[PDB]
Amino acid sequence: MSLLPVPYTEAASLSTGSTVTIKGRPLVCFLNEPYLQVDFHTEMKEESDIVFHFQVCFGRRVVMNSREYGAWKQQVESKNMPFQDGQEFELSISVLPDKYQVMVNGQSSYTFDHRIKPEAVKMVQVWRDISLTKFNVSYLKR
């Protein structure tokens, strides 16, 4: 169905048991190194701090980080690449007690230990070289 705006911004609250579900596809072939970025922000402003930064270079690598009082922290780099050239993906990001868990097409693929409480999140931004059909944050839990 319908394409969502990219960059995509949604005001958001997160806590343990929250799930962020993203369905999209890369705009171009992996040879051209399309990117995907998901940022969990502390304010609606784009320049605000990032509790969780998740950046895919499709076909190549993923980096995760935080941006705290305007400054990037220690980068985690992964060469794990479950994403398939030319294919629609479903990303789900689960807020566990101790970490974010990133599922790609139902497969556990990345985790990132909380550096800031997930309750600090006020906004989620999904951007770079993708089309987006689905975005959901669950709000079912106390």
Residues near its own copies (CB under 8 A) = 7, 27-29, 31-32, 35, 39, 46-47, 70, 127-129
| CB 113, CB 6: distance < 8 Å | no
CB of 62 to ligand FUL, least distance (A): 10
Q: What is the three-class DSSP state of 120?
A: helix
CB of 133 to ligand FUL, least distance (A): 25
Which of its own copies, ligand FUL, none does residue 116 bind to, with CB < 5 to 8 Å depending on kind? none
Which of its own copies, ligand FUL, none does residue 129 bind to, with CB < 5 to 8 Å depending on kind? its own copies
Beta-bridge partners for 107: 104
Which of its own copies, ligand FUL, none does residue 31 bind to, with CB < 5 to 8 Å depending on kind? its own copies
Which of its own copies, ligand FUL, none does residue 28 bind to, with CB < 5 to 8 Å depending on kind? its own copies
- Cα-atom radius of gyration of the chain, to the nearest Å? 14
CB of 142 to its own copies, least distance (A): 33
Comparison of 5 and 106: residue with beta carbon closer to its own copies: 5
Dihedral sign for Cα atoms in the order 17, 120, 89, 101: negative
Measured CA to CA in angstroms, residue 67 lies from 54, 64, 74, 106, 126 at distances of 12, 10, 9, 28, 16
**Is omega for the bond preceding 7 within 30 degrees of 0, making it cis?**
yes
Q: Contact residues for ligand FUL (CB under 6 A)?
A: 33, 55, 63, 65, 72, 75
